[PDB]
Swiss-Prot record:
PANTHER family: BCL-2-LIKE PROTEIN 15. GO terms for biological process: apoptotic process; regulation of apoptotic process. Keywords: Apoptosis. The keyword Cell division does not apply. GO terms for cellular component: cytosol; nucleus. The gene is BCL2L15. It comes from Homo sapiens (Human). This is Bcl-2-like protein 15. The lineage of its organism: Eukaryota, Metazoa, Chordata, Craniata, Vertebrata. InterPro entries: Bcl-2-like_sf, BCL2L15. The keyword Protein biosynthesis does not apply.
Length: 141
C-alpha cells in the first residue's frame, strides 16, 4: 500500500507540473502533493547541472544510478549548511524540486524519471522508515 501510495504521489506531482488543467479538472493525494511541493520550494541550490545529468542518463536508460547519487549529493550539501534539517526530509524535498525543474526544463522526457524516482523512494529504507515514522504519507508535513 505504501509502495502504491508513493506511485500515486509521484504521478500526482508530475501530472500537476505538466497539466494544470488536469489538476483543476480532476488517502487524499492532492493535500500530500501540496505539502511535498511546499517542502520542495525550501531548496534554493543550483539544479541546472544536476537536472541535465539525470535527464541525459534517463534517455540512455541508466536513471537508477545517477538519480539517487544526485539527490544524496544535494541533500548532504544542504544538511551540511543547515544543521536543523533532517537528511530524510532533505532527500524528499530535493526529489520534488528536481522533478519540478526537470518538468519545466525537459517536459518531453521528464515522464521517464517518474518510475525510477518511485523505485528510489520505495527502495530506500532510511526514507521509507522516516515517512512511516511521521505517520506515513497521510501525516507527512
Amino acid at each position: 500500500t505504501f509502495e502504491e501510495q508513493t506511485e500515486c504521489i509521484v504521478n500526482t506531482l508530475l501530472m500537476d507540473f505538466l497539466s494544470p488543467t488536469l489538476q483543476v479538472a480532476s488517502f487524499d493525494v492532492a493535500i500530500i502533493a501540496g505539502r511535498l511541493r511546499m517542502l520542495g520550494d525550501q531548496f534554493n541550490g543550483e539544479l541546472e547541472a544536476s537536472a541535465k545529468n539525470v535527464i541525459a542518463e534517463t534517455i540512455k536508460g541508466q536513471t537508477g544510478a545517477i538519480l539517487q547519487d544526485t539527490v544524496e549529493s544535494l541533500s548532504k550539501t544542504w544538511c551540511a549548511q543547515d544543521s536543523s534539517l533532517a537528511y530524510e526530509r532533505a532527500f524528499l524535498a530535493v526529489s520534488v524540486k528536481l522533478l519540478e525543474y526537470m518538468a519545466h526544463i525537459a517536459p518531453e522526457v521528464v515522464g521517464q524519471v517518474a518510475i525510477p524516482m518511485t523505485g528510489m523512494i520505495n527502495g530506500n529504507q532510511a526514507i521509507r522508515e522516516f515517512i512511516q515514522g511521521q505517520g506515513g504519507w497521510e501525516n507527512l508535513e
